[PDB]
Amino acid sequence: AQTTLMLSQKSDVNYLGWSTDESKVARQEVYRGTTSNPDLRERIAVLDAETRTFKDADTNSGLNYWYWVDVVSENQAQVVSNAVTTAPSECKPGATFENRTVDCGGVTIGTSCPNDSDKQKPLIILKNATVKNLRISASGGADGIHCDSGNCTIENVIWEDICEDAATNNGKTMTIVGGIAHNAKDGYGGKPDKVLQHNSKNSTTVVKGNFTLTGEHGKLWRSCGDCSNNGGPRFLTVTSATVNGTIDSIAGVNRNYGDVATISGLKIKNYKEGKPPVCEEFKGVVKGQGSTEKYGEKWDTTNCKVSRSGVSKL
Template sequence: MYSKLLLGLCLTAVVSSVSATTTISGTKDYGGATVGTSCDGSSESQSPVFVLTDGATIKNVVIKAGGGADGIHCLGSCTLSSVKWNDVCEDAATMKGGSGKTMNVSGGTALYASDKVFQHNGIGSTVNISGFYANTIGKLYRSCGNCASNGGPRKVNISNTTVANVSASVVGVNGNFGDVATITTLKVQGWKKGSPAICVNYKGVQSGSESSKIGEEWSSTACKVSTSNITAY
């Protein structure tokens, strides 16, 4: 009885809610703690749970269901190491860093992203995703199709990653802006060529209109991936 009570107290102690965005500089290791703010559905006006300044690293944190808001915003180069989203609210993380900046996603999981897991806004920057797992998502990654002063290039590199229950496509990029997706090792639950689409090329536009889908591509300028890079399971 005592040990169960003590365990319950310990579990309670590492689950917390905060009412405002937490800004991180340097390295912050949460040691597996569960945190979160709120979630207003797919509202794009929500504040992020975390803002990472240039060079920041966040490690070993669980963002609770109902508390994901607009996820994590990366303002420059940043690292997300073993970050878990129990239920993505708007987006899990958004890369806002500009030319020459890199967002590294190492390990971690994301569940229930009705739209996308990773949003890429910063022009001239790169997102690296490795060792990640996502389930029940619209897309794993999308470069912004209609940001203000939109352009490119934006680059994404995906390796040793597993996805399941993808409703739209794994990746979406804007070939007309010079975006490039490079996928080397990707496992996709139940994959048959075309279902789900792996890398879809779009025509990106400026804010105020909607980007248009060109279609799934293989071994193209925008989509550097071949069927040999994909494993169905």
């Protein structure tokens, strides 16, 4: 088995994101040191087997740090990641991956993110494919990653500043496994909007592995509200995610099209009921054939399958 680790620094917090192919994970341990010597690293956290992200806010400004993540199997196997530090090739813009998994090895890719653009291109297109360990540059997020057919997995991807959006589901099932997505007010792409855009129908967007949002965001997922040839049903399944920053709302479902958002394991910084609203119901429309409407935040309804127990203060 193997584990690949990536690091992203945000607001004096070091965020770690990793992917692992170990199938029987029991626990995961985070190690840190002030030097590159792995023999001197010391454990700073013991985590459950499901998360794929971690945040370290206990560092001093005058030091550099090295991190490693040890994925421990039920049978004592130590699957240790590469080291990452704060100390100062198939994955290229426009690439399409089909029916296979591509490990980007932690490289960075990006093009641009022009102000006021009406159309931007995807950096990576997946067709029943998986991409893992990739960083999207702050100034070149363009239209993120597209799942254009079948089942796609976006595993341990870091968006330094989401441009139009982070990922788009134009396929059957798009799964986000871990990853860290940053957005900011006045950042690239304008006012923060959605992270995950969902256009296909009879399809699902899945969020797990403690996908983490940092900075300021519009919403985590939106079933297209006014797409050409709009309709549904569109589904969202959230089992583990964290918002360590601010967000306007979490999910937007078009209840008239049968959309259903099923949410639990959601942690939000300083969460208060209604701040932010989690699942909101809307009326979706076909472009040019009517106006959308917002009905409001809902709990335990047909289309908003989220209970108060599904969301908590981080």
